Structure 1
Amino acid sequence: PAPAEVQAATLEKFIQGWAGWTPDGFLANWSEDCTQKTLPFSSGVPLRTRADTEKLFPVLMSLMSNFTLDIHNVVHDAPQGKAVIYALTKADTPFGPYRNEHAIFLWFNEIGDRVQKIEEMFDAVVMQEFLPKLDKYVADNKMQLGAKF
């Protein structure tokens, strides 16, 4: 129900904040009550709060250097306040080269200046080797995040 030009500006700011690869710069575009869901539902990963996200992303971005974002497809449904992005990522990690692809569904808030809900499906076969190394990493350094992956 937010204006389309307001939604489109948030969509671009969301992409630029993601490509900038800073926690504050990316989380600028998320509302205070934004949740993240990992798809598929069969994976059984619980919803992540904004507080979970604020702990996970600094760990993520400190371990992924030379981050590169390739935007492949953007689909914006302004009357519904929804958008979809298919993107490809790459980076260097202590665990070796990182390669991922994302299908990200977004919901804008009523004002349209923030993202209120995120559902994300990614390269699950490749990530079933990388994400557990992240969790083992967090445990070995006693970083006690209260959130996994």
Structure 2
Amino acid sequence: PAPAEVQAATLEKFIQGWAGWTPDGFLANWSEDCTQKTLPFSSGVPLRTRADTEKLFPVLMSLMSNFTLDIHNVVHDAPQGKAVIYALTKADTPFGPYRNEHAIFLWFNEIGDRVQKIEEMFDAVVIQEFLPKLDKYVAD
């Protein structure tokens, strides 16, 4: 894997792209083959490709305003090219305040300048429930 300081720079940019709460900014640090997989595996939530995320995050980020990201724990394994972030998110929607918490497992690419794989344990009800309901709305 890449040197620790190269990986660490990517890890920091990943976090600031998330905190920036824009689709292009967040995806800037994905590799081209990067995927996101919701945990636990038992929930059977389909993998998200980079393209899936480009289509999904504009509406999702528009729904949640005043987004703030609290980084509670960062664990960086430079010899393995891996990291974990525990993050707490807060936002507003018309349905009131919004909160989530994420245990996000990251793999860096070999060059070390991108995130190549994400596995994420979080409250997935929005992508599990509310999103089959948009598929049918644009279907209608």
TM-score, normalising length from structure 1? 0.84
What is the number of equivalent residue pairs in this alignment? 140
Secondary structure at the aligned position of 1:76 is classed as: strand
| Cα offset, 1:87, TM superposition | 0.3
| Cα offset, 1:123, TM superposition | 3.0
* Alpha-carbon distance in 1 for matches of 2:64, 2:23: 12
Secondary structure at the aligned position of 1:90 is classed as: strand
CA deviation vs aligned residue, 1:76-127 (integer Å, no higher than 9, x gap): 0000000000000011123322110000000000100000000000135798
* Alpha-carbon distance in 2 for matches of 1:127, 1:101: 14
Residue segments in structure 2 that go unaligned for 5+ positions in a row: none
The two structures, once aligned, show a CA RMSD in angstroms of 2.2
Secondary structure at the aligned position of 1:102 is classed as: strand
Identity of matched residues, %: 99
TM-score, normalising length from structure 2? 0.89
| Cα offset, 1:75, TM superposition | 0.1
Secondary structure at the aligned position of 2:47 is classed as: coil
| Cα offset, 1:138, TM superposition | 6.4
* Alpha-carbon distance in 1 for matches of 2:57, 2:126: 19
* Alpha-carbon distance in 2 for matches of 1:133, 1:119: 24
Cα gap change, 1:127/1:110 in structure 2, threshold over 3 Å: closer, same or farther?
Answer: closer
* Alpha-carbon distance in 2 for matches of 1:47, 1:28: 19
